[PDB]
């Protein structure tokens, strides 16, 4: 009935919301609430059909490659297993968590919520994990990666669409529609109903875990979930600065150390991101452009945007507040797509696997690249725009 914006602390009465459209903050125009849409039974049915479809969308080969008279069948599991067997277990695990593990966690969370309704078990942290797992469930990014890799290796060998590609595309569509029609605030209010306020109190706080506006209890925790309720984050600026510095430090090895080692006819190329993007611009510039803008343009843009936002916070500048929030939203929207390079190199090293004529391997820089991407994503997520609004 009445809420406060989690981004600019605008205290406003929220009218009743139908299934059509949604609501937004009057000041900053931020997505605040959703209504109606699908139900928990439909979510459980989607989780069940995903559980049925995922093993046959993963184990089955995505596409068949005829290279040098040899037919090779490859898939996500083969790529990740090759990554772990080479020695880059952390890169293999992060790719696995991004691609395969995150839908598994989503299905497990849906089943856990259903069984909690059936039995009576606690369901508080599972809802927070479900809310924050949408940024990490990435299958369309892997679809773009396999498309890019197929276009890249179209000239090297012969590519035929496999049976597993159709199931993978169906899984991508199902996960996309389920995540788009999955509502977390509705689930929170259904599972743990609460009460609204008198539309004007000027003493309400917004929980950053469940988007509930209200008064903290005598223990200082949120009434809806068992986390403390504060005005802002505890150490938002310190966490953002630490993650930004870590990503800045780790970006240098990702570009200096070689990213791809190509054994051609017994000789290794050992080329970094810059050399690879230069060769790809020389050969197949059409996909080199998207690879460039998704591999090196996005991370540095995010780094400089976060650095300028923190400098504006320190300086208490009040000139471009209308544009800084838009830039932050754009960075939040675009930072998820920086993981395309890891998926592309995983699929290419799974496909091109000749013994000595053509052996593509991932060098000791993709770990630093992925760590930098994860750290800058965490920095963007941990940055609190209410500090930007209070800088005035």
């Amino acid at each position: 009935d009445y809420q406060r914006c989690p981004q600019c602390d605008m205290l406003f009465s929220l009218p009743e919301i139908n299934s059509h459209q949604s609501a937004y903050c009057p000041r900053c125009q931020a997505k605040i609430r959703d209504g109606r849409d699908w139900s928990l039974t439909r979510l459980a049915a989607m989780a069940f059909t995903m559980l049925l479809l995922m093993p046959f969308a993963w184990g089955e080969p995505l596409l068949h490659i005829w290279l040098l008279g040899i037919r090779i069948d490859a898939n996500v599991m083969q790529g990740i297993w090759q990554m772990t067997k080479q020695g880059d277990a952390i890169t293999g695990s992060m790719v696995f968590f991004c691609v395969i593990g995150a839908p598994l966690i989503l299905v497990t969370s849906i089943a856990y919520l259903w069984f909690g309704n059936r039995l009576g078990m606690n369901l508080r942290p599972v809802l927070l994990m479900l809310e924050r797992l949408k940024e990490w469930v990435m299958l369309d990014i892997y679809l773009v990666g396999i498309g890019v890799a197929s276009i890249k290796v179209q000239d090297y060998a012969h590519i035929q669409a496999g049976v597993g590609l159709f199931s993978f595309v169906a899984l991508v569509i199902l996960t996309t529609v389920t995540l788009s029609h999955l509502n977390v605030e509705e689930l929170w209010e259904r599972f743990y109903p609460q009460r609204p306020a008198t539309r004007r109190d000027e003493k309400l706080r917004v929980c950053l875990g469940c988007h509930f506006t209200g008064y903290p209890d005598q223990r200082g925790r949120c009434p809806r979930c068992h986390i403390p309720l504060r005005l802002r984050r505890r150490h938002s600026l310190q966490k953002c600065w630490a993650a930004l510095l870590a990503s800045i430090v780790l970006l240098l090895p990702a570009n200096l150390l070689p990213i791809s080692i190509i054994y051609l006819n017994g000789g290794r190329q050992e080329d970094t991101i810059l050399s690879g993007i230069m060769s790809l611009a020389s050969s197949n510039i059409a996909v080199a452009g998207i690879v460039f803008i998704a591999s090196i343009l996005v991370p540095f843009t995010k780094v400089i945007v976060m650095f300028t936002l923190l400098l504006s916070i320190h300086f208490k500048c009040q000139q471009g507040l209308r544009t800084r929030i838009l830039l932050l939203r754009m960075v939040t929207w675009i930072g998820r797509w920086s993981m395309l390079d890891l998926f592309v190199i995983s699929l290419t090293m799974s496909l091109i696997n000749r013994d000595q004529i053509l052996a593509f391997t991932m060098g000791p820089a993709a770990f630093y690249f992925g760590a930098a991407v994860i750290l800058t994503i965490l920095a963007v997520e941990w940055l609190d725009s209410r500090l930007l609004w209070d800088a005035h």
Binding site: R42, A45, M46, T49, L52, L53, F56, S167, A170, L174, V177
Partner: peptide, 30 residues
């Protein structure tokens, strides 16, 4: 509607049946 999950279930059943139909046998050679 439930038509989309029904179609997904039908496709999953079809691919499971296809997988179970034509699995070969294991032969051991020294």
């Amino acid at each position: 509607f439930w038509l989309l999950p029904f179609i997904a279930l039908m496709i999953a059943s079809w691919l499971i049946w296809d997988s179970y139909q034509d699995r070969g046998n294991t032969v051991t050679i020294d």
